[PDB]
Scaffold this active site. Structure first.
Site, PDB file in Angstrom:
ATOM      1  N   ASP A  18      17.975  16.762 -37.233  1.00  0.00           N
ATOM      2  CA  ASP A  18      18.705  16.513 -36.007  1.00  0.00           C
ATOM      3  C   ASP A  18      20.152  16.124 -36.430  1.00  0.00           C
ATOM      4  OD1 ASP A  18      18.899  15.772 -32.890  1.00  0.00           O
ATOM      5  OD2 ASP A  18      19.503  13.888 -33.824  1.00  0.00           O
ATOM      6  N   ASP A  64      15.846  10.874 -34.462  1.00  0.00           N
ATOM      7  CA  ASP A  64      16.064   9.506 -34.007  1.00  0.00           C
ATOM      8  C   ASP A  64      15.835   9.277 -32.514  1.00  0.00           C
ATOM      9  OD1 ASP A  64      18.489  11.075 -33.511  1.00  0.00           O
ATOM     10  OD2 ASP A  64      19.400   9.164 -32.934  1.00  0.00           O
ATOM     11  N   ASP A  83      13.588  14.331 -29.925  1.00  0.00           N
ATOM     12  CA  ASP A  83      12.919  14.717 -31.154  1.00  0.00           C
ATOM     13  C   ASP A  83      11.433  14.389 -31.131  1.00  0.00           C
ATOM     14  OD1 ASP A  83      15.381  15.572 -32.386  1.00  0.00           O
ATOM     15  OD2 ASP A  83      15.852  13.455 -32.733  1.00  0.00           O
TER      16      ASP A  83
END
Ligand SMILES: *[C@@H]1O[C@H](CO[C@@H]2O[C@@H](C)[C@@H](O)[C@@H](O)[C@@H]2O)[C@@H](O[C@@H]2O[C@H](CO)[C@@H](O[C@@H]3O[C@H](CO[C@H]4O[C@H](CO)[C@@H](O)[C@H](O)[C@@H]4O)[C@@H](O)[C@H](O[C@H]4O[C@H](CO)[C@@H](O)[C@H](O)[C@@H]4O)[C@@H]3O)[C@H](O)[C@H]2NC(C)=O)[C@H](O)[C@H]1NC(C)=O
Ligand SMILES: *[C@@H]1O[C@H](CO[C@@H]2O[C@@H](C)[C@@H](O)[C@@H](O)[C@@H]2O)[C@@H](O[C@@H]2O[C@H](CO)[C@@H](O[C@@H]3O[C@H](CO)[C@@H](O)[C@H](O[C@H]4O[C@H](CO)[C@@H](O)[C@H](O)[C@@H]4O)[C@@H]3O)[C@H](O)[C@H]2NC(C)=O)[C@H](O)[C@H]1NC(C)=O
Ligand code: PCW
Ligand code: PCW
Ligand code: PCW
Ligand code: PCW
Ligand code: PCW
Ligand code: PCW
Ligand code: PCW
Ligand SMILES: *[C@@H]1O[C@H](CO)[C@@H](O[C@@H]2O[C@H](CO)[C@@H](O)[C@H](O)[C@H]2NC(C)=O)[C@H](O)[C@H]1NC(C)=O
Ligand code: CLR
Ligand code: CLR
Ligand code: CLR
Ligand code: MG
Ligand code: MG
Ligand code: NA
Lengths: 993, 294, 40
Positions: free
Chosen positions: A346, A687, A691
């Site tokens: 990410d 985080d 996700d």
């Protein structure tokens, strides 16, 4: 819980009007709802609070550890042992209790292993529970025309809700009136910068429009009003959390290896049993006995200690990770990192710091770079010119942000700053390389300031001059580089002033495009000294008419800013790429920024080019170039929505550097699935909540600890409590090291198998006295052997592990036939021969020569024959010959230990030589010493021939296994030699594990 | 999978390899195992060269001799009906097997048998344990010596009318000299009368104090009429140096045995180099559970 | 020798056990030494 209706992309009613909205849900735009109606809806559909996760009693995760694949094999073994005991009890009188002992021992082994594994997962659960800090929150709702602050759990759909900069958006609102209200959509949509929320509609995508507030989002600056459109679990993040919880877990790789291992162990066990069953029926024995023989051989081929050894081995590799701040919730998730071959990461919160920081600065016709690293470990920007001083004064003065009270302890970068992100970054840079800004501001009193207009696109203000020799007035303005450029006529070069000729104007244009192309946001700072003759010290410059010269100012320099990446991000990405791990960026941020971050962290290696880059370098349309000449590709989310499965497969099959931008959480999950469809392991590092669906479906999830969300933290498998990305490299290294160690330990615990079974086989076929008793096999499998097998984990690398390519899952297994050919075929055979040698020696020294032993078991066992003639003619009673047989069991067990010495030494290294690696493993040395001390203790301690039935040995016997041990050492030494000199030869494809 | 890994027709592979591979692996294992066998055999031959043919190196696990008998009892119990003949057959068969080795036809000529004192005597040393002198000579032991239990008169040996016999025997040990207790003031009660130094005494009794009364007259038969073993039949030089060697025997008739009741009779030998063990119930003594149910 | 050859049937298992235990203890100690040699 329809999963398909939850897998679809979010839909909405944003494209409407205020009248249509109020007419659909029912609500007064100026008076809100009524208390009676509000309570009627509150009770009609439920509080605005997410449902709690599915609890789990402690006895359930205990019964889970008692089962599985290995513990189940030991369970069936115990069951078989008790079955054979029952048969012997109902068929024969004076049944031996050997089987009942072996069965209770197996049950105890399984119970102990379960207790240990459960205790570890509970430890991790406690340290994990110490992080959920939930403080109640109350929202501001307008009912019947009055403002009231009520608990967040009392908000319903339809009432009016007001927000203020600093508060959190309760539910999914529909903005009706805003006043410069900015919102932070980093957790949900992943937008690094604060998107302004406006009552008007702008994009067809609900995540892109500005007239909708989202759950769990915070209002950075401004105030706004809105009608609650979505409430409770029905919110966006509510459906996302419900989808995450409604997903399967999967099956890691170490488990599949253990399963195939048990498959081989059972294959050879049932083969030896059915074969010696037909053979026993061919030699005369009865059925009742043959059944016991079958069960005995099957049980004898089961490793009781391999379970405890494997569990302790993995736990040992887990404590190091806990020492470096890498916590794993499960126990097998420690090896998945080493087997990973495609890491999906990410950007916001994981690859970057999610904090705006001054990156580049322009002054004195020269681009200067500033340190944008968390711990401030870099290069300064030459703070010796006067231009920099003037720039610092402009930035430190023309800025209204100030550090939040009580931050004197935190560092200059991690403290809280009340204000915009740009002003915060400027304030932090000035406080970083220019000392206390509070004194710099009190040193020059601000007299008049003109706020930032949407039309003026500039912020200006006049303050007094701290020069004790100059009482003039200072004017400082900041804004867009174009607007500021159109208002100047001089340039502060190296301190002096110069005209604004086209030469520096073109240099400024090139600098603007240079900082702009870098994905950064650039601003311009300029100032001017007001003549005290036309504006005395007493004249007040009220902000009403043109009291200050808008033009003829002195431009000092540009100041760029952008969110930088974490310190160890580039190095970690490079290390992962070196190990053959494909790094694919997956983020829901703008592509213009995603591509820049990718090139800056190593995802898009410098030199590679995209189809658009080629079309721009050639000045030709994009539809003409061939997509095969582009190694890296940037796939937009909008385009990803209309792509088939084969197209995605080809995208991952032809592009080595892929960057997915503007991808929704569902699309992230689709990408992970598209990566798994081929056959590679996946590791997702995130985080935020976006996700969560990606961390769950991935083979292994890595969630951030400080900057991570609670949902993604609870749905992940590994947590980074320190937010350090280098831990991924450390993990991929440890995952391999403990794999080669598991192989060594398995071969070790499997080599002893043969010298533990062969005696019984020769007992039934050759009719010789029993060589290896049951309490000796138990003292070997569960005693001495444990420490060495555990020590085999502390072995260091032989070659560079961070250099070889990832192991192939379809071909390179954990337990192949090359191992079985060694343990069961070559080393175990020699160990069995050594044991039989010591056996025959003990019986030959007491009077029973090898020629008279074949055919004696019928009378050697009979309990009523008190006169058994030996090779010399002596008459031996029953108990006397039994004492000798027991002493033969003791010497057989000691012979096993003697050959295990050389087996542990040849198992220490798989390819390299002992004179190269070295005996630096202190645990292995301690294992050998303890292994010998235990055997001597079990034989020489008084009262052992009564309790365990082990008699003392005569000092000349202990040396009957030494030659076999040295031979084993020499054979394996020459073995590990042709492999080195001859790479790829017969010895390699035949004996290289 | 299932079919392919078994037989493919493109690479002409069976189970995984081609024709020449299974041969390479089989040949390697044959040579390897052959070397293993030859090495084990050599290490066993050196062991055969380390031991002597006339004497066991270690004789400590057989120091205190045992005391066995002629009948083969499953649980040291003798139970048989005086009516049903197919009840004591297992006993007579054994007894006969034991006495069938003392037949006079077997003991004949000067070699290798020698006539010894008809009355108990002392030890006899036929030299050392060597091959210098040929096969040593052993004393003759006649059947008839055992008077009412010899199978020569009443083949059954007693079991026919409630008067069974029990032929006791001392475990043969190489170079073992039996030594009896001396005439000093300390000696069991029983042993005082008939102290023939040259005889190792054997005396049976009742395990419990109660059973005494229910046990009748223990009549022992032996060499010279004594209840023991003559010292002249020792020592034993081992099979290799004394084939055709006969060990003394002692017959015991349990006359006047109470009917329909389990009697525990413990027989015990007395002597210096004789020691009993609480774990081995056959070291020096022996137990029998007779029950003549009729 | 001859009649009083009683020694031919005796073995000092006691002394053997004593020595074997002393040795076992020593080996155990050495092991511990090696194990802790480095953490001090
Ligand atoms: C050691 O001595 C054993 C006894 O020797 C006998 O007595 C000594 C003192 C000498 O006089 C010697 O010459 C005697 O023979 C000797 O065992 C004997 O072997 C013979 C030959 O097989 C047996 O004779 C056969 O008897 C059966 C029936 O036996 C019944 O009694 C015995 C108990 O005595 C039971 O065990 C049986 O179950 C029976 O209840 C006859 O049926 C058989 O018939 C055969 O001979 C006739 C002619 O007579 C033929 O018409 C037939 O066709 C048969 O061929 C024999 O008559 C004798 O029973 C047996 N004695 C005992 C006590 O078992 C032994 O073999 C010698 N061993 C060595 C190693 O020297
Ligand atoms: C083994 O030992 C026994 C017993 O020995 C005696 O006790 C020992 C512990 C030790 O103190 C010895 O010194 C001691 O003698 C031997 O048998 C004993 O033999 C004597 C002698 O014949 C017997 O004594 C007799 O007792 C009779 C009444 O009980 C008495 O009438 C006898 O008269 C005879 O002697 C007198 C002189 O005293 C003479 O005038 C008579 O005319 C007649 O000859 C005689 O006193 C003991 O009773 C015997 N003991 C037992 C238990 O029977 C035994 O001979 C010996 N064996 C060997 C091989 O040495
Ligand atoms: C009293 C006397 C004492 C007796 C004691 C006996 C002790 C027993 C000792 C050992 C047990 C031997 C049992 C057999 C072991 C075979 C090992 C085995 O099955 O392992 C499994 C392997 C799988 O491996 P993988 O996962 O890497 O495959 C990957 C394939 N991918 C990747 C292409 C898909 O499968 C394979 O190897 C394929 C299967 C091959 C099977 C060969 C069978 C040979 C057995 C006997 C031969 C005897 C002949 C004797 C006559 C000789 C002529 C003179
Ligand atoms: C007839 C009887 C048959 C018996 C058969 C069974 C035998 C099995 C038992 C023992 C086998 C011993 C094998 C000896 C191997 C020695 C190898 C050796 O010496 O290789 C030298 C290494 C290499 O150094 P380097 O160049 O990499 O260093 C670089 C340093 N830098 C980095 C600073 C530059 O140096 C090192 O490993 C560092 C120093 C390590 C010193 C190890 C000494 C301990 C050795 C054995 C322990 C005894 C066990 C006894 C078990 C019985 C219990 C009762
Ligand atoms: C870093 C931490 C270091 C810690 C190291 C710890 C090491 C501990 C070292 C020694 C302690 C061991 C236990 C001591 C046992 C004393 C037993 C004893 O003194 O017995 C004496 C009497 C024998 O008398 P007697 O000669 O008259 O009998 C004649 C019998 N007739 C004539 C009928 C044959 O005993 C009897 O009677 C009855 C015998 C009772 C049997 C007890 C044996 C226990 C059995 C298994 C436990 C062993 C597990 C292994 C643990 C390994 C730990 C490392
Ligand atoms: C970290 C390093 C650890 C090292 C430790 C080594 C691990 C050992 C692993 C397995 C060994 C355990 C096997 C248990 C064997 C029990 C044997 C048993 O029950 O035999 C029953 C005997 C009966 O015999 P009989 O019929 O001939 O009697 C005839 C009596 N007449 C004739 C006079 C009437 O009764 C007797 O011996 C009575 C005396 C009872 C003796 C119990 C001894 C228990 C020994 C160990 C249990 C604790 C081990 C826990 C440590 C785990 C380590 C991971
Ligand atoms: C009490 C216990 C005693 C135990 C003693 C054990 C001693 C026995 C040791 C070895 C005997 C086995 C020799 C077997 C020779 C026939 C094997 C054969 O037919 O092989 C053919 C290949 C040549 O084919 P290629 O690779 O060119 O074809 C390529 C084909 N493709 C592609 C499949 C690779 O051969 C090659 O590669 C060359 C490889 C030859 C194998 C070398 C192994 C040496 C191992 C140990 C010797 C050390 C003994 C030390 C003992 C000291 C005692 C104090
Ligand atoms: C690098 C790794 C280092 C590892 C070091 C480990 C430390 C070793 C620790 C101790 C070993 C020493 C043991 C000494 C014990 C002697 C005690 C004793 O008094 O024992 C006498 C027995 C004779 O018993 P018997 O049956 O005749 O009488 C029985 C008579 N009753 C039963 C009537 C009394 O004798 C015996 O046990 C013989 C004892 C065994 C003899 C030791 C042989 C050593 C083998 C190889 C080492 C060679 C080193 C070469 C140097 C190279 C330098 C570069
Ligand atoms: C950080 C530094 C750590 C340092 C720690 C150091 C620890 C201390 C080290 C060594 C201590 C040595 C103790 C020596 C004990 C000698 C006992 C002994 O010699 O007894 C023998 C006699 C039994 O002979 P028997 O006639 O029945 O033979 C059978 C004859 N048949 C069967 C033919 C009739 O004893 C008896 O009668 C009475 C026996 C009474 C019970 C004694 C208990 C001994 C058991 C364990 C102690 C040993 C532990 C050593 C450490 C090992 C660690 C793994
Ligand atoms: C054998 O035992 C019997 C008893 O079973 C003894 O004879 C008994 O003697 C008593 C007198 O003490 C009489 O009252 C009984 O009538 C007798 N019974 C029988 C069956 O005779 C006999 O004395 C014992 N004989 C020997 C030699 O011990
Ligand atoms: C006690 C004695 C007679 C038993 C001898 C058994 C021998 C012949 C058995 C035991 C283990 C067996 C081997 C075990 C493993 C493999 C690997 C496999 O991919 C092919 C078969 C092969 C190469 C086997 C050949 C036969 C083998 C060596
Ligand atoms: C290094 C390896 C391969 C060498 C192995 C050599 C083997 C084959 C040799 C070593 C000792 C030899 C044996 C030694 C003793 C005897 C006894 C004799 O009366 C006949 C030959 C016989 C039975 C031999 C057969 C072959 C043998 C076992
Ligand atoms: C590193 C290698 C070569 C060291 C090998 C050491 C071997 C030879 C040592 C380790 C333990 C030792 C034995 C330990 C116990 C006993 C019992 C004692 O009453 C006599 C010595 C005796 C019989 C020892 C003989 C030698 C021995 C087996
Ligand atoms: Mg993020
Ligand atoms: Mg085992
Ligand atoms: Na998972």
């Amino acid at each position: 819980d329809l999963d398909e209706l939850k897998k679809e992309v979010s839909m909405d009613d944003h494209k409407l009007s205020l009248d249509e909205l109020h007419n659909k849900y029912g609500t007064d735009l100026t008076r809100g709802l009524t208390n009676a109606r509000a309570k009627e809806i509150l009770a009609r559909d439920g509080p605005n609070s997410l449902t709690p996760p599915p609890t789990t009693p402690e006895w359930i995760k205990f019964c889970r550890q008692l089962f599985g694949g290995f513990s189940i094999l030991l369970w069936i073994g115990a069951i078989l042992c008790f079955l054979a005991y029952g048969i012997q009890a109902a068929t024969e009188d004076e049944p031996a209790n050997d089987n009942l002992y072996l069965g209770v021992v197996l049950s105890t082994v399984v119970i102990v292993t379960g207790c240990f594994s459960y205790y570890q997962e509970a430890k991790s659960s406690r340290i994990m529970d110490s992080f959920k800090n939930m403080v109640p929150q109350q929202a501001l709702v307008i009912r019947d025309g009055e403002k009231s602050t009520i608990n967040a759990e009392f908000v319903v759909a339809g009432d009016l809700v007001e927000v203020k900069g600093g508060d959190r958006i309760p539910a999914d609102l529909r903005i009706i009136s805003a006043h410069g209200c900015k919102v932070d959509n980093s957790s949900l949509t992943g937008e690094s910068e604060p998107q302004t929320r406006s009552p008007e509609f702008s994009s067809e995508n609900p995540l892109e429009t500005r007239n909708i507030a989202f759950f769990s989002t915070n209002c950075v600056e401004g105030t706004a009003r809105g009608v609650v459109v979505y409430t409770g679990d029905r919110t966006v993040m509510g459906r996302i959390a419900t989808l995450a919880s409604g997903l399967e877990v999967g099956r890691t790789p170490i488990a599949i290896e253990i399963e195939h291992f048990i498959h081989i162990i059972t294959g050879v066990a049932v083969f030896l049993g059915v074969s010696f069953f037909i053979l026993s029926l061919i030699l005369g024995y009865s059925w009742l006995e043959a059944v016991i023989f079958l069960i005995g051989i099957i049980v004898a081929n089961v490793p009781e200690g391999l379970l405890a050894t494997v569990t302790v081995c993995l736990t040992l590799t887990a404590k190091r990770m806990a020492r470096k701040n890498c916590l794993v919730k499960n126990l097998e998730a420690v090896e998945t990192l080493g087997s990973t071959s495609t890491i999906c990461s990410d950007k916001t919160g994981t690859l970057t710091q999610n904090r705006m920081t001054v990156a580049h600065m322009w002054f004195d016709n020269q681009i200067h770079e500033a340190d944008t690293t968390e711990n401030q470990s870099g290069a300064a920007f030459d703070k010796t010119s006067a231009t920099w001083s003037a720039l610092s004064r402009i930035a430190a003065l023309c800025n209204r942000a100030v550090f939040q009270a009580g931050q004197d302890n935190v560092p200059i970068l991690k403290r809280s700053v009340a204000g915009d992100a740009s002003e915060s970054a400027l304030l932090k840079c000035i406080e970083l390389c220019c000392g206390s800004v509070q004194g710099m501001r009190d040193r020059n009193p601000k007299i008049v300031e003109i706020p930032f207009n949407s039309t003026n696109k500039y912020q200006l203000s006049i303050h007094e001059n701290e020069k004790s020799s100059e009482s003039r007035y200072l004017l400082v303005m900041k804004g867009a580089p174009e607007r500021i450029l159109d208002r100047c006529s001089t340039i502060l070069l190296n301190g002096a002033e110069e005209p604004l000729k086209e030469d520096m104007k073109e240099a400024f244009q090139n600098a603007y495009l240079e900082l702009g192309g870098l994905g950064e946001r650039v601003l311009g700072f300029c100032h001017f000294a007001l003549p005290e003759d036309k504006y005395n010290e007493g004249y007040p410059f009220d902000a009403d008419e043109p009291n200050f010269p808008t033009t003829d100012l002195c431009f000092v320099g540009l100041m760029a800013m952008i969110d930088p990446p974490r310190a160890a991000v580039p190095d970690a990405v490079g290390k992962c790429r070196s190990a053959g791990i494909k790094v694919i960026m997956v983020t829901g941020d703008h592509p213009i920024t995603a591509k820049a971050i990718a090139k800056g962290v190593g995802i898009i290696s410098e030199g590679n080019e995209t189809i658009e880059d080629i079309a721009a370098r050639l000045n030709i349309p994009i539809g003409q170039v061939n997509p095969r000449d582009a190694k890296a590709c940037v796939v937009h989310g909008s385009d990803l929505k209309d792509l088939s499965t084969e197209v995605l497969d080809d995208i991952l099959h032809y592009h080595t550097e892929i960057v997915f931008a503007r991808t929704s959480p569902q699309q992230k999950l689709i990408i992970v699935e598209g990566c798994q469809r081929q056959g590679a392991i996946v590791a997702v590092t995130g985080d935020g909540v976006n996700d969560s669906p990606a961390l769950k479906k991935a083979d292994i999830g890595v969630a951030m600890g400080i900057s991570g969300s609670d949902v993604s933290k609870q749905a992940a498998d590994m947590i980074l409590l320190d937010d350090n990305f280098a831990s991924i490299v450390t993990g991929v290294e440890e995952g391999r090291l403990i794999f080669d160690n598991l192989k060594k330990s398995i071969a070790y615990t499997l080599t002893s198998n043969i010298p533990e079974i062969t005696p019984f086989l020769v007992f039934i076929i050759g009719n010789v006295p029993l060589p290896l008793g049951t309490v000796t096999i138990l003292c070997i499998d569960l005693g001495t052997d444990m420490v060495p097998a555990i020590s085999l984990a502390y072995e260091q690398a032989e070659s560079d592990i961070m250099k070889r390519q990832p192991r192939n899952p379809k071909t390179d297994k954990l337990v192949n036939e090359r191992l079985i050919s060694m343990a069961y075929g070559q080393i175990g055979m020699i160990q069995a021969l050594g044991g039989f040698f010591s056996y025959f020696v003990i019986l030959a020294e007491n009077g029973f020569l090898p020629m008279d032993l074949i055919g004696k078991r019928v009378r050697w066992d009979d309990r009523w024959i008190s006169d058994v003639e030996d090779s010399f003619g002596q008459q031996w009673t029953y108990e006397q010959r039994k004492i000798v047989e027991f002493t033969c069991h003791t010497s057989f067990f000691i012979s096993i230990v003697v050959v295990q010495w050389a087996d542990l030494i040849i198992c220490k290294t798989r390819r390299n030589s002992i004179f190269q690696q070295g005996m630096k493993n202190k645990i292995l040395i301690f294992g050998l010493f303890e292994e010998t001390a235990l055997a001597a203790f079990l034989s020489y301690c008084p009262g052992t021939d009564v309790a365990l039935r082990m008699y003392p040995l005569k000092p000349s016997w202990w040396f009957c296994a030494f030659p076999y041990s040295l031979i084993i050492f020499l054979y394996d030494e020459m073995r590990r030699f042709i492999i080195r000199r001859s790479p790829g030869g017969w010895v390699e494809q035949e004996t290289y594990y | 999978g299932w079919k392919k890994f078994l037989w493919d027709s493109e690479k002409k592979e069976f189970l995984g390899r081609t024709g020449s591979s299974w041969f390479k692996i089989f040949l390697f294992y044959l040579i390897f195992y052959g070397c293993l066998a030859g090495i084990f055999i050599g290490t066993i031959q050196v062991l055969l060269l380390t031991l002597s043919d006339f004497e066991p190196k270690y004789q400590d696990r057989v120091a205190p001799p045992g005391l066995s008998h002629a009948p083969y009892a499953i649980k040291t119990e003798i139970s048989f009906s005086i009516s049903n003949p197919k009840s004591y057959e297992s006993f007579v068969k054994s007894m006969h097997k034991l006495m069938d080795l003392y037949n006079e036809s077997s003991q004949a000529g000067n070699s290798p048998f020698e006539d010894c004192s008809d009355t108990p005597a002392d030890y006899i040393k036929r030299g050392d344990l060597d091959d210098s002198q040929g096969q040593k000579k052993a004393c003759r032991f006649s059947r008839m010596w055992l008077k009412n239990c010899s199978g020569l008169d009443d083949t059954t040996y007693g079991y026919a009318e409630g008067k069974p016999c029990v032929v006791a025997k001392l475990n043969r040990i190489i170079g073992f000299y039996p030594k009896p207790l001396k005439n000093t003031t300390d000696l069991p009660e029983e042993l005082q009368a008939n102290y023939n130094q040259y005889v190792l005494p054997l005396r049976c009794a009742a395990k419990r104090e109660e059973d005494r009364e229910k046990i009748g007259s223990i009549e022992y038969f032996g060499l010279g009429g004594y209840a023991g073993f003559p010292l002249q039949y020792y020592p034993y030089y081992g099979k290799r140096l004394q084939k055709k060697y006969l060990q003394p025997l002692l017959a015991i008739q349990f006359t006047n045995l109470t009917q329909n009741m389990e009697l525990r009779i413990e027989c015990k030998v007395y002597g210096e180099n004789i020691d009993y063990s609480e774990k081995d119930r056959f070291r020096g003594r022996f137990e029998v559970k007779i029950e003549v149910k009729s | 020798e001859g009649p009083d050859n009683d020694e031919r049937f005796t073995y000092d298992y006691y002394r053997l056990r004593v020595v074997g235990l002393i040795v076992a203890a020593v080996l155990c100690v050495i092991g511990i030494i090696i194990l802790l040699a480095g953490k001090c």
